[PDB]
Design a protein around this ligand. Sequence first.
Ligand SMILES: CCOc1ccc(S(N)(=O)=O)cc1
Ligand SMILES: CCOc1ccc(S(N)(=O)=O)cc1
Ligand SMILES: [Zn+2]
Length: 257
Amino acid sequence: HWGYGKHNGPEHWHKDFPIAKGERQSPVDIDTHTAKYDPSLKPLSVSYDQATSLRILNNGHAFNVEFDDSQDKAVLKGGPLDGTYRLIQFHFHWGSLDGQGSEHTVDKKKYAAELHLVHWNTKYGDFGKAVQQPDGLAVLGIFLKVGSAKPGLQKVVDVLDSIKTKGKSADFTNFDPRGLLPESLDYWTYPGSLTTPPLLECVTWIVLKEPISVSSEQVLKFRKLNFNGEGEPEELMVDNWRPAQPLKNRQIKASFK
Ligand SMILES: CCOc1ccc(S(N)(=O)=O)cc1
Ligand SMILES: CCOc1ccc(S(N)(=O)=O)cc1
Ligand SMILES: [Zn+2]
């Protein structure tokens, strides 16, 4: 099974998922000087007021906070997107050290972690069908740096004790993801992929320029999670990030001058 260890990590994935060496893989380094301002890009529309969280799950690669996506309750639209994308889950990638952890980089800078809010295009009916389409998903990526605490993150941090190991889930209702957003919605955007297997090339990436701050204590609690299942040898869930992939024939666009 794929993972993030020495023997099953990102350099191994291509053997079972040949699209790993494809033409629009993610993440990438965002070269801020080469990204071009696109005045035709619209403001992002993030409508999370009726979001319904249900559950939080340790899936052995990260933890997902899952949402009820059976109605238009929490949607992303505008920006580079045509149509409406429904929030299905968010998760993070993070490091063993504050100096690494993000998947995207900015002028080669690595952040301590990266939040992915995952949305699927409602014109494809559900997530499973959407990932088979080039415009199936929109993932909103938000960088985390270590400094002041993020109050809106704390309810997530405090439930992690109950989902320490792979396969554990817990009820997680009434969580408001608006508490995880930075002030500015300025963004970079490019066509890419899932950053884990199956690495499908189905994502419009929207990466916010402004990081959020989280406390050292908050990210420390991320690092207490386990990749393993209960009763298996303990392997800390850290460094669950894929490194930057070749940009190839793509242009990253900026929403801002
Ligand atoms: C269990 C055999 O070890 C493996 C299994 C899968 C992979 S993958 N999916 O990264 O190519 C690597 C080593
Ligand atoms: C079935 C896998 O679903 C995924 C996998 C990866 C991502 S990410 N890390 O690109 O945002 C989202 C959904
Ligand atoms: Zn992700």
